[PDB]
Amino acid sequence: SNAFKEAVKSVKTILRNLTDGEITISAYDTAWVALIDAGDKTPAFPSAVKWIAENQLSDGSWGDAYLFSYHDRLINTLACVVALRSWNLFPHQCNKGITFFRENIGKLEDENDEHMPIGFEVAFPSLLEIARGINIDVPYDSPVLKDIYAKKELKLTRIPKEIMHKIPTTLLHSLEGMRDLDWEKLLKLQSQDGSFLFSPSSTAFAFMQTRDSNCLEYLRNAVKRFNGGVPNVFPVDLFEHIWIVDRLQRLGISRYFEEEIKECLDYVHRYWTDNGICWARCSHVQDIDDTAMAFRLLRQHGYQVSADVFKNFEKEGEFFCFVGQSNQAVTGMFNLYRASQLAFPREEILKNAKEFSYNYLLEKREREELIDKWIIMKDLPGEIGFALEIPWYASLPRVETRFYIDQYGGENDVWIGKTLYRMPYVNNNGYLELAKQDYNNCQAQHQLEWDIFQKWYEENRLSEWGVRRSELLECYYLAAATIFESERSHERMVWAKSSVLVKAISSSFGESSDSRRSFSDQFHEYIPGSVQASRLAGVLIGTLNQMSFDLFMSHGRDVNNLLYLSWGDWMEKWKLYGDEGEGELMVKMIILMKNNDLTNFFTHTHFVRLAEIINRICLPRQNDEKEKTIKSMEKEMGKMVELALSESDTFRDVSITFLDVAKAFYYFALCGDHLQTHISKVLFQKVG
Ligand SMILES: C/C(=C\CC/C(C)=C/CSP(=O)(O)OP(=O)(O)O)CC/C=C(\C)CCCN(C)C
């Protein structure tokens, strides 16, 4: 007991105390740092030397202890051996590394599945030549190595080295492998924290060549922050802030951290620029992955961000991770896809982005190529598959969350830079535990109400009023998958019950003006065909009364009058034309059942404008004519997204309710023919 509360607390302290990043140490990078000469032929950073000796793995290698990769182990180990030997320190660990290297170098190509660390083919041979330079006894002539030495010389002939010296590029992240270097020019492309593109190793190499004091400071700060070691990229503050918020929302638990998340997004917004962003604040080089994620979250939470930010990544209708490079990672395109779906109608560049990323991912799934360069994830195919299957316009919170809890790798995910690395605050088993418990608690609540909802259906003999059992479950499902919180049962239930009653009335009396007239008369008279019209009316009136009573008994709020007015307003329009304003009725019901006083907005202009949009979306449930219908909903929803997202956090509760109802209808229009598995997972299959 309270274990849950105390776990929310520990996640809150994490969020409150985020700095420049919780990222694991890179042995490769701290080796480069350890090589630095203080000047008097002693290490400038003895604590980096110490870290290396202290963190060697049991088999003599250095690297990620939980995910073995020959590439990762060998480059990490060779670097550490070089560092220790060049100072003749810690000969015992230095000897173990050498043995490991001797015995495993021939296994470099033994893994079909392994990813390559970034820039391995230039970085590996370069520290090989450093090792040979200090007479380290290692098989420099290992057959596997002939192939990677050739690859290096060719990589280098292709590098735009002159451009590398004139403008900031990703190449600055890996200088330690290159040869023709003009430091007078490069130092002008130094980052504002003194690093060369937030790489300690590239920066360490630069310091050895220039003795530049700003490089030293970057190194000093990092070495200190990490007690001797350094990561392979730092800072990683935007990356971490953004990814933490994305994961908490998708895990379905973000509502516990609304204050903390708001503060994270303010931080991010603070460092947003018209060119976008990268993983670290104050960069001259941006990437589409970080930009698309920040863009999506900022816009989603009411920040004003422009889509012109994506213009720089666009070339000839295609989109790229980095300006001036051809790289197009699956995860970046995935995040681009997600971002593009929050486009306002005026934003052409996002239409093109959406068109491009969708087809990119589509093709890559068809080809069996959903593998990413930047990360090793539990279930990338499943995440992409979901995204392609379920547009944001049709993405109900519980549905996305139910699948993602199954996809989230927790602490098992591994990121890929110059070496393998982890992000403990993004990929965290604790978040998952919390997510599973919270999901299961809410689900249990939903099952209770499903049982109540069925009894209600039976007691009122609604099956004889033309409501099928399959329709009953679908109605409850849409409400619960949207308004899912345990403490929001009144909103969830009024919506589910209202939609059912609307379907019964429409099926039993919607056929013609007379029957509709017949029914509305009875409703008002109550408060052959006229006898039963009175019966159904009693069901409506009956359940309306029960609901307001329960609200009154638990929250003191009396909503009787507004309740009947709303139903009254709907009855008149339907009377005259048939079902036309169901969407609006649902929204009003939900707002009424809220434990607030938002009903005063029913008057506001903003409210009215949203009402007419939603009524264009929520069609009176009725091949090629289908594409038309769905495409038309999207255009109307495009307008609603704009209106709703750009809202002061007072009326926002209302605007968001319009979106919720709209998405539900959209989802049903799109997927309503094959919901059985979704419903089963969301409502009836426990997580874990
Ligand atoms: C500057 C970096 C990459 C170099 C450019 C690349 C990879 C080109 C691929 S081509 P290549 O593999 O051929 O490389 P070369 O061998 O040519 O140097 C990325 C450093 C940032 C991180 C690690 C954090 C990522 C955060 N988030 C976006 C995930």
Short mmCIF file of C-alpha atoms in Angstrom, two decimals, residues 238 271-278 280 282-283 285-288 290-292 294-295 306 308-310 312-313:
data_model
loop_
_atom_site.label_atom_id
_atom_site.label_comp_id
_atom_site.label_asym_id
_atom_site.label_seq_id
_atom_site.Cartn_x
_atom_site.Cartn_y
_atom_site.Cartn_z
CA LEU A 238 16.88 18.24 -24.86
CA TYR A 271 15.74 26.41 -26.22
CA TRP A 272 13.54 26.01 -29.29
CA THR A 273 14.75 27.85 -32.41
CA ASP A 274 13.41 28.54 -35.91
CA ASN A 275 15.90 25.98 -37.25
CA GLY A 276 14.77 23.37 -34.74
CA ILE A 277 17.09 21.62 -32.29
CA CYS A 278 19.38 18.66 -31.67
CA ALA A 280 21.65 19.29 -26.67
CA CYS A 282 22.48 25.79 -28.03
CA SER A 283 23.72 23.85 -31.06
CA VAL A 285 23.58 21.68 -35.92
CA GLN A 286 20.00 20.44 -35.74
CA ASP A 287 18.47 17.01 -36.40
CA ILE A 288 14.98 16.08 -37.60
CA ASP A 290 14.81 15.85 -31.96
CA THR A 291 13.09 18.63 -33.88
CA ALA A 292 10.05 16.52 -34.80
CA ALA A 294 9.91 18.71 -29.67
CA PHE A 295 7.63 20.14 -32.35
CA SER A 306 6.04 26.95 -36.60
CA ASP A 308 8.87 26.30 -41.21
CA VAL A 309 11.36 24.69 -38.85
CA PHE A 310 11.14 21.57 -41.04
CA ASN A 312 15.76 22.99 -43.77
CA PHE A 313 15.48 19.17 -43.66
#
